[PDB]
Write a protein that binds this ligand. Structure first.
Ligand SMILES: Nc1nc2c(ncn2[C@@H]2O[C@H](COP(=O)(O)OP(=O)(O)NP(=O)(O)O)[C@@H](O)[C@H]2O)c(=O)[nH]1
Ligand SMILES: [Ca+2]
Ligand SMILES: [Mg+2]
Ligand SMILES: [Mg+2]
Length: 166
């Protein structure tokens, strides 16, 4: 049926893999195993439409992000993830937005800004600060927790709804 190619990007350790695995496999990965490039596929019904989700989980660690650019080129929408307890990952979003623009050769790419680890209390990125960044990009800001599942489905489904507006 209809297929949506989603790509999850962001700094190392922000929770890209945990988010993807929680969405697809329904469990929380507690350990930290740096990702090279992994893909997941699953048939789901989103807003009444039966579709195929192809999610590319990318590397956030520089040393493991070799051919990242090439893997991303096929993506139709991107989840730009940072962790609410990692100010540097939030400041890093700028770099991922630029990479996406290069990979897609477009300044109009479906995207969603995601502030992950919202279950943690050492918050250094306030909601309003992220809402403002998202507003400047003209995209939605959603907070998530791969641990509790809060906002996880919302984040991924919202990205699909953004692709549909493209
Ligand atoms: N409390 C909490 N921990 C989280 C959350 N998401 C991820 N983590 C934890 O953060 C660590 C890194 O998560 P991981 O998904 O591997 O991050 P990544 O962005 O995929 N890293 P990499 O880019 O190297 O592939 C793990 O110990 C994981 O359990 C969350 O929502 N809440
Ligand atoms: Ca391990
Ligand atoms: Mg990972
Ligand atoms: Mg501050």
């Amino acid at each position: 049926m209809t297929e949506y190619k989603l790509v999850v990007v962001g700094a190392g350790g922000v929770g890209k893999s945990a988010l993807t695995i929680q969405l697809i496999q329904n469990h929380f990965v507690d350990e930290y195993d740096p990702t090279i490039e992994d893909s997941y596929r699953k048939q789901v019904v989103i807003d009444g439409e039966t579709c195929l989700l192809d999610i590319l989980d990318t590397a956030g660690v520089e040393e493991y992000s070799a051919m990242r650019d090439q893997y991303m080129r096929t993506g139709e929408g991107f989840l730009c993830v940072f962790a609410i307890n990692n100010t540097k990952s939030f400041e890093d979003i700028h770099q991922y937005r630029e990479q996406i623009k290069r990979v897609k050769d477009s300044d109009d790419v479906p995207m969603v800004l995601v502030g992950n680890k919202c279950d943690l209390a050492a918050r250094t990125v306030e909601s309003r600060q992220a809402q403002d960044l998202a507003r400047s990009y003209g995209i939605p800001y959603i907070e998530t927790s791969a641990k509790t599942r809060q906002g996880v489905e919302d984040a991924f489904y919202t990205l699909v709804r953004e692709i549909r507006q493209h």
